[model samples]
Target: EVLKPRTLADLIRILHQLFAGDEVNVEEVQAIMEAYESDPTEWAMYAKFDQYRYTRNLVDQGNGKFNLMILCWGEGHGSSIHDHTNSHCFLKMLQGNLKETLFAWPDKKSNEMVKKSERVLRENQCAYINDSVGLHRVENISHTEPAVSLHLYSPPFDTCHAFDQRTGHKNKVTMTFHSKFGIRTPN
Candidate 1:
């Protein structure tokens, strides 16, 4: 039997079907992402790059349910240590390579984060993380090229706590889109 070519529209359509059910079965989602060999050209329209920071391009959004985004990361751009805040965050590496550094949540009375693990994720790789596994900072590790990642946040949040790993101080930050539905937003 011939296989059906996986496309970005197919992914979005199927995800909506699954999420419409009672639970957003993450394992099932992982399986779907693993099977897809996303072509960079397929999602190229959403790659909006910024020199000073990463760009979060909103592709699909649900009413207080889920947020699907395309994140464009430039060289030397890394997120501050941040918690997922009651959401399950999944990322599929689409282009170039990125460093994912995991950390233990900040300690009570001290709020010091402990680095637990770090690794480089390559194209087509998928990562599943939540607050239970602690916090993370994803960085564009390449010096020559930009990175693009597909992210899904379930039971989506508008604000999340960010921390300085060195000082361990936590502050809440609101997340906004650099683009919506393939169009760039005002700065």
Candidate 2:
């Protein structure tokens, strides 16, 4: 059952409360993530999509401590196997279906990343990951239905590490959004 935080404002307030401490743990954020039901009406504007993954930045606390965003995924589209670069992620499925796979480096000094686990996230379901984890990828599982998800990141990131799973190559890249603050313009 969906728990507390009936509105976006309520979510913001609770996120602030949970992170008010010097450090935010995965459990607290995971609980908070499951504590709310995302009303699509409240985030419809950020639901724009493309043939590719479309990311929209909804809110940036501006203190560089936290930010919220929504991503729209077309059929067969997904993110590259990547790392959060020291940021924490709280994800909630908003509409349709998605498959999330977590991966890890076999050895801290090796380039080879291995899949640890994978799961499908349906509407209202949530997932959490901390930056220390190695790699992950999210894909829209429906061939006919598009998918959308809400994500909250701690200490908002500007760059991240992405890996070429087959080649064992990794690189750091800048992150960009399709839109910022509900503006539907791509960067």
Candidate 3:
């Protein structure tokens, strides 16, 4: 898994490869990680890319198969409590620290809101994203700097429910998918 995406162009090229369209699953995520973990320059190139706190675009891989653009988060910003549509996701930290939390979505049970679903992220840390996981949030807990992260999904992330900690309410939001070059989702 030596992905040497030395430049933005190279990174784009890799995304193009993922766009070939297939039954995207955990294996594909593993392959993507392998390609990246084996190349120092590629990793550096990914890290060197300017960090911005924003979701780029949506990737449509066809047959409902798709992934997302890499998202880079700056300091002082975090995301709302949200849950993907039980999709497979890979969260690879590129640079800095990301304060991430996991939740357990069990049935229609209420009152179990915001117990203990949090963790501090360091560089190169990856989180397993699955449906069993509940509403969670990630903040740039760097306190002094920004963080970069890459998020990949299969069938694309179209709808995600945001949870209101205080009210235990959830809202569904329509998401856009990104192909070779598109918008990245928030942290």
Q: What is the Å distance of residue 167 in model 1 from its true position?
A: 2.7
How are the candidates ranked when ordered by lDDT, highest leading? 1, 2, 3
What is the per-residue lDDT of model 1 for residues 49-117, given as tens digits with 9 covering 90 to 100? 988999999888854468989999998788988998989888999888889999987665565568899
Per-residue lDDT of 26 in model 2: 73
Residue 66, model 1: Cα distance from true site in angstroms: 1.2
Q: Is candidate 2 or candidate 3 better by TM-score?
A: 2
Candidate 3 lDDT trough over 10 residues, lowest sum = 176-185
Give the clash total for candidate 3: 16
Scored by lDDT, model 2 comes in at 0.77
Better of 2 and 3 by lDDT: 2
| Tens-place lDDT digits, model 2, residues 27-115 | 76676676778788887877777765556556547345688888888887788888887778888888888899998754436465678
Q: Which is the leading candidate under lDDT? A: 1
RMSD of each: 2.3, 2.5, 5.5
Question: Alpha-carbon error at 145 in model 3, in Å?
Answer: 0.9
For model 3, residues 1-187, the per-residue Cα lDDT tens digits are 4555455345545665665665544555544553454233443323322344434333224334556445556667677777768777767676677888876553565555664567886566556576666667888886577666767676576688877766566778776432234333344
